Point group: C2
Chain length 235, copies 2
Amino acid sequence: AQAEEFKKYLETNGIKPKQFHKKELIFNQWDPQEYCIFLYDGITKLTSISENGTIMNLQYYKGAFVIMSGFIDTETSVGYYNLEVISEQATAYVIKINELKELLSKNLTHFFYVFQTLQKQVSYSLAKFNDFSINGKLGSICSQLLILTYVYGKETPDGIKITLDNLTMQELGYSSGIAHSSAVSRIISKLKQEKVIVYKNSCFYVQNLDYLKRYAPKLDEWFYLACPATWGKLN
Amino acid sequence: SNAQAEEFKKYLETNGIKPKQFHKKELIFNQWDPQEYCIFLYDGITKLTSISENGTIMNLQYYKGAFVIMSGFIDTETSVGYYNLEVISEQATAYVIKINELKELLSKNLTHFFYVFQTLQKQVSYSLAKFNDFSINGKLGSICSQLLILTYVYGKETPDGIKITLDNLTMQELGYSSGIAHSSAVSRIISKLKQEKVIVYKNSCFYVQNLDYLKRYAPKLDEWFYLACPATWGKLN
């Protein structure tokens, strides 16, 4: 993997792996230092918290990927957010945004690795913006379940199980723009009656992937074009 | 800087890639016959669109001035997705780099590799800010957010308020930016902003009277403009 070789390149340049447990914040929106984090193992989400305390979930990040809170060119903030750990365990190499440019200059197979993750991210946020915007809040819930089925799902004799040890009703609402937790509950019950989803084991299971797929066409296309292994597993 | 953009332009010309002229309503690329490029848009105004099977038009984003727009992945040479890039100004000039030539060019001069990397970091951050603000307060917040955006980039101080100087900009086009397909849904929001004295529609142009009001609904974007485009932000203070 490129991830494996980047991991090694990091350890060889004195950058060591740091472990985290559930609910720990790799960075926070008040930290005045900026970073590049190479998330290597684990599951994570990016949040923003309002002036009043309202919480928006911007995105899940899994597996090996990179997340940046600063600009290389200027070293200043891209904007203020948190990266929270969701899984029982995660590991990440934290680099100061001031050290990045020199690291990537030196070994440009790694420069292209990070640019690749930037292209994926660029393209992903666009697809997601298209699908969340059309069909309003119905399509938002269908779009987020589709993302979670492709990334975290698993084949199972009773459907496709979403392997998120938590995933609460309120948590889904934070990812859509939904303030009331009962509004989410309507959407979830409405999808249950039509045999789209089921809920057992403290876990969500999907059963008409085709239905979701119809509310989230730009994203399905994106899994196909950007992550064809992940996509082919359930297609 | 933006001396960086001029420098990239010069580097491309030296290396045999020539400028190209496009005209209002032309497509540089389209979603039905996808081609893979780096578009270096040098001068003029464009919009990235998608049209769904039922005829629903989504305006994803406006692109101006100097900027970079990718339609393929360099590592794999395939599509990032199916979109249209449509010219809004009367003229626009762009450098159309084939995706299979880009790596070579960026590999021989890291200065320009980093200018492209920076532009893409600005895109990522812009999309997150816009997603935050469009999501939190329904369609009211989406329309206020797109107005603040167009006010910073295309606005001009006049005696009647900040005039959005953008060729068309109709009710319907404004609705396309936030997944609104019926004009009646937009006018309902614009009616409220008019009653509340935030905007005036006059001489076929929107004039903004209370930018501070739009900031309440678009707090992540105003922060993004502050951090990412301080000259543009400073102009309107």
